[PDB]
Design an enzyme around this catalytic site. Sequence first.
Site, short mmCIF file in Angstrom:
data_model
loop_
_atom_site.label_atom_id
_atom_site.label_comp_id
_atom_site.label_asym_id
_atom_site.label_seq_id
_atom_site.Cartn_x
_atom_site.Cartn_y
_atom_site.Cartn_z
N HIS A 1 0.82 -1.20 0.00
CA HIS A 1 0.00 0.00 0.00
C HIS A 1 0.86 1.26 0.00
CE1 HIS A 1 -0.03 0.38 4.59
NE2 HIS A 1 -0.13 1.66 4.20
N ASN B 1 17.39 12.10 11.69
CA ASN B 1 16.59 13.23 11.33
C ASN B 1 16.40 13.27 9.82
OD1 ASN B 1 15.56 15.86 10.84
ND2 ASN B 1 16.13 16.39 12.94
N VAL C 1 17.38 16.78 8.20
CA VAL C 1 18.74 17.29 8.32
C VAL C 1 19.70 16.25 7.78
CG1 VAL C 1 20.45 18.13 10.05
CG2 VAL C 1 17.99 18.56 10.42
N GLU D 1 23.86 9.26 5.84
CA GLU D 1 22.84 8.92 4.86
C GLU D 1 23.44 8.29 3.61
OE1 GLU D 1 23.19 12.06 6.14
OE2 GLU D 1 21.28 12.65 7.00
N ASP E 1 0.02 -7.52 2.02
CA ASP E 1 0.49 -6.15 1.99
C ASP E 1 2.01 -6.12 2.12
OD1 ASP E 1 0.54 -3.38 1.81
OD2 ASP E 1 -0.28 -3.01 3.87
N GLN F 1 -0.09 6.22 10.95
CA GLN F 1 0.11 6.84 9.65
C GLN F 1 1.56 7.30 9.51
OE1 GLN F 1 -3.15 7.38 11.21
NE2 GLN F 1 -3.67 5.87 9.67
N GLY F 2 2.21 6.88 8.43
CA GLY F 2 3.57 7.30 8.15
C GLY F 2 4.57 6.27 8.62
N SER G 1 3.80 3.09 8.07
CA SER G 1 3.47 2.03 7.12
C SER G 1 4.68 1.57 6.33
CB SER G 1 2.46 2.46 6.18
OG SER G 1 1.24 2.61 6.87
N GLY G 2 4.82 0.25 6.16
CA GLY G 2 5.93 -0.29 5.38
C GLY G 2 7.15 -0.64 6.22
CA LIG Z 1 19.08 12.95 7.72
#
Ligand SMILES: [Ca+2]
Length: 223
Positions: A40, A54, A57, A62, A84, A174-175, A177-178
Amino acid sequence: IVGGYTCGANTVPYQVSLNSGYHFCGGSLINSQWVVSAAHCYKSGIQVRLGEDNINVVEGNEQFISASKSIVHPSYNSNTLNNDIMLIKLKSAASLNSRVASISLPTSCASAGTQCLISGWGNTKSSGTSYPDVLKCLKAPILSDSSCKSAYPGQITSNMFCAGYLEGGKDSCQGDSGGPVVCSGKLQGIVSWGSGCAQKNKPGVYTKVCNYVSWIKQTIASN
Ligand SMILES: [Ca+2]
């Protein structure tokens, strides 16, 4: 995550953010080139963001890698949310390190009573809206199939389990998900659905990953 805690930066090294201009779903890194998420959550234009704390930021750990291919489960039903689950292949392999790491797939399913770690950047309020910048975490147990089915009559399939707290106050939202549900170092669930968030008698519902390991492994081996 409602009723959880700040995980700590890069303490959940398999947690990814799916970004299409903004975070919109979680996922889990299962090897250097593949992510598992919820069907979904499908859309085109996904960038996978690894190594995040974060999400607003650039903090230095990353890795941002475009998806080259998305594969929604062949039997996904968006009405019932049965099956799902979706796989995302990265255009290049991630560089794995202490802060960007794959999570093991299960060899057997988890049981009611096992404690698990659920994480994500989703809403932190149950009667409110507030989206965190840093990753949030929740320790929660798997609930019995019978209490899951009683909470959600006619809705729980063999590819779903419940986890959390019937009393309310602690859940994914919510958010999230996954994203992952990890139990004893194995990815056992995917954040899928629930009625509101953290409501009494309405625990989270998760995709039961152990049912999908054959599909995951064969899919990876041919793509
Ligand atoms: Ca970051």
